Design a protein around this ligand. Structure first.
Ligand code: MH0
Length: 104
Protein backbone atom coordinates (compact mmCIF):
# COMPACT_ATOMS: atom_id res chain seq x y z
CA UNK A 1 0.00 0.00 0.00
CA UNK A 2 2.12 2.94 -1.27
CA UNK A 3 2.35 5.84 -3.75
CA UNK A 4 4.60 4.32 -6.42
CA UNK A 5 2.62 1.05 -6.53
CA UNK A 6 -0.59 3.14 -6.19
CA UNK A 7 -0.28 5.40 -9.24
CA UNK A 8 -0.14 2.19 -11.36
CA UNK A 9 -3.78 1.65 -10.19
CA UNK A 10 -5.19 5.16 -10.76
CA UNK A 11 -3.34 5.78 -14.08
CA UNK A 12 -4.73 2.41 -15.30
CA UNK A 13 -8.42 2.35 -14.12
CA UNK A 14 -9.24 5.94 -13.14
CA UNK A 15 -7.20 8.76 -14.86
CA UNK A 16 -9.28 8.24 -18.04
CA UNK A 17 -11.97 10.17 -16.01
CA UNK A 18 -10.14 11.77 -13.00
CA UNK A 19 -7.10 14.05 -12.40
CA UNK A 20 -5.05 14.82 -9.22
CA UNK A 21 -3.41 18.04 -10.58
CA UNK A 22 -2.83 21.08 -8.27
CA UNK A 23 -4.81 24.14 -9.48
CA UNK A 24 -7.47 21.72 -10.83
CA UNK A 25 -8.94 20.79 -14.22
CA UNK A 26 -12.13 19.07 -15.48
CA UNK A 27 -12.69 15.73 -17.24
CA UNK A 28 -15.39 12.95 -17.34
CA UNK A 29 -14.83 13.05 -13.52
CA UNK A 30 -13.49 15.46 -10.82
CA UNK A 31 -9.94 16.56 -9.83
CA UNK A 32 -9.99 14.91 -6.33
CA UNK A 33 -8.64 18.23 -4.92
CA UNK A 34 -8.25 17.79 -1.14
CA UNK A 35 -10.55 14.68 -1.07
CA UNK A 36 -9.42 13.38 2.38
CA UNK A 37 -10.90 14.55 5.72
CA UNK A 38 -14.25 15.59 4.02
CA UNK A 39 -17.53 14.57 2.37
CA UNK A 40 -17.92 15.95 -1.26
CA UNK A 41 -21.02 16.54 -3.53
CA UNK A 42 -20.77 20.40 -3.38
CA UNK A 43 -17.47 21.97 -4.63
CA UNK A 44 -17.21 25.18 -6.80
CA UNK A 45 -16.52 23.06 -9.94
CA UNK A 46 -16.96 19.38 -8.88
CA UNK A 47 -19.19 16.54 -7.58
CA UNK A 48 -22.67 17.43 -8.91
CA UNK A 49 -24.23 14.21 -7.53
CA UNK A 50 -24.73 14.83 -3.81
CA UNK A 51 -25.18 11.47 -2.00
CA UNK A 52 -21.37 12.19 -1.76
CA UNK A 53 -22.40 14.95 0.77
CA UNK A 54 -25.15 13.01 2.64
CA UNK A 55 -23.29 9.69 3.46
CA UNK A 56 -22.51 10.87 7.07
CA UNK A 57 -18.79 9.77 7.00
CA UNK A 58 -15.74 11.22 5.15
CA UNK A 59 -13.34 9.94 2.52
CA UNK A 60 -10.66 7.98 4.43
CA UNK A 61 -8.74 4.72 4.43
CA UNK A 62 -11.59 2.28 5.40
CA UNK A 63 -14.44 4.23 3.60
CA UNK A 64 -12.72 4.31 0.19
CA UNK A 65 -12.03 0.53 0.54
CA UNK A 66 -15.76 -0.28 0.82
CA UNK A 67 -16.81 2.38 -1.75
CA UNK A 68 -14.33 0.94 -4.27
CA UNK A 69 -15.54 -2.63 -3.52
CA UNK A 70 -18.88 -1.59 -5.20
CA UNK A 71 -19.46 2.21 -5.82
CA UNK A 72 -23.23 2.56 -6.61
CA UNK A 73 -24.26 0.74 -3.38
CA UNK A 74 -22.06 2.68 -0.91
CA UNK A 75 -23.15 5.96 -2.59
CA UNK A 76 -26.68 5.08 -3.85
CA UNK A 77 -26.82 8.00 -6.35
CA UNK A 78 -23.51 8.89 -8.13
CA UNK A 79 -22.11 9.50 -11.69
CA UNK A 80 -19.24 7.08 -10.81
CA UNK A 81 -19.64 4.56 -13.72
CA UNK A 82 -17.39 1.78 -12.35
CA UNK A 83 -18.38 -1.78 -11.22
CA UNK A 84 -15.86 -2.62 -8.41
CA UNK A 85 -12.16 -3.28 -7.52
CA UNK A 86 -11.98 -7.05 -6.77
CA UNK A 87 -8.65 -6.81 -4.79
CA UNK A 88 -8.10 -5.11 -1.41
CA UNK A 89 -4.30 -4.91 -2.02
CA UNK A 90 -4.82 -2.72 -5.16
CA UNK A 91 -7.38 -0.54 -3.27
CA UNK A 92 -4.75 -0.11 -0.52
CA UNK A 93 -2.00 1.04 -2.98
CA UNK A 94 -4.59 3.34 -4.72
CA UNK A 95 -5.68 5.02 -1.43
CA UNK A 96 -1.97 5.47 -0.48
CA UNK A 97 -1.22 7.32 -3.74
CA UNK A 98 -4.32 9.55 -3.39
CA UNK A 99 -3.25 10.55 0.18
CA UNK A 100 0.13 11.67 -1.23
CA UNK A 101 -1.28 13.53 -4.29
CA UNK A 102 -4.56 15.12 -3.01
CA UNK A 103 -2.79 16.72 0.04
CA UNK A 104 0.22 17.98 -2.00
C1 MH0 B 1 -15.43 7.89 -15.67
C2 MH0 B 1 -16.44 6.97 -16.36
C3 MH0 B 1 -15.05 7.43 -14.28
C4 MH0 B 1 -14.14 6.43 -13.96
C5 MH0 B 1 -13.51 5.43 -14.90
C6 MH0 B 1 -13.83 6.56 -12.56
C7 MH0 B 1 -12.87 5.80 -11.90
C8 MH0 B 1 -12.47 6.00 -10.57
N1 MH0 B 1 -13.02 6.87 -9.66
FE1 MH0 B 1 -14.59 8.07 -9.99
N2 MH0 B 1 -16.23 9.41 -10.45
C9 MH0 B 1 -16.91 10.13 -9.51
C10 MH0 B 1 -16.65 10.21 -8.14
C11 MH0 B 1 -15.55 9.60 -7.53
C12 MH0 B 1 -15.11 9.91 -6.19
C13 MH0 B 1 -15.56 11.12 -5.39
C14 MH0 B 1 -15.02 12.42 -6.03
C15 MH0 B 1 -15.65 13.73 -5.55
O1 MH0 B 1 -16.80 13.73 -5.05
O2 MH0 B 1 -15.01 14.79 -5.75
C16 MH0 B 1 -14.01 9.12 -5.93
C17 MH0 B 1 -13.24 9.07 -4.64
C18 MH0 B 1 -13.70 8.39 -7.14
N3 MH0 B 1 -14.65 8.71 -8.07
C19 MH0 B 1 -12.62 7.51 -7.29
C20 MH0 B 1 -12.35 6.80 -8.47
C21 MH0 B 1 -11.28 5.85 -8.64
C22 MH0 B 1 -10.22 5.54 -7.61
C23 MH0 B 1 -11.40 5.30 -9.91
C24 MH0 B 1 -10.63 4.12 -10.48
C25 MH0 B 1 -10.88 2.84 -9.68
C26 MH0 B 1 -17.99 10.81 -10.17
C27 MH0 B 1 -19.15 11.50 -9.49
C28 MH0 B 1 -18.91 12.98 -9.20
C29 MH0 B 1 -20.02 13.85 -9.79
O3 MH0 B 1 -21.16 13.82 -9.29
O4 MH0 B 1 -19.75 14.59 -10.76
C30 MH0 B 1 -17.80 10.64 -11.53
C31 MH0 B 1 -18.50 11.40 -12.63
C32 MH0 B 1 -16.75 9.66 -11.69
C33 MH0 B 1 -16.36 9.11 -12.91
C34 MH0 B 1 -15.41 8.09 -13.03
N4 MH0 B 1 -14.62 7.54 -12.05
Amino acid sequence: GDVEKGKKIFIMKCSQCHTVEKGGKHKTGPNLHGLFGRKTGQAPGYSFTAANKNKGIIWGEDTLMEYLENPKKYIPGTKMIFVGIKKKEERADLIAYLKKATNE
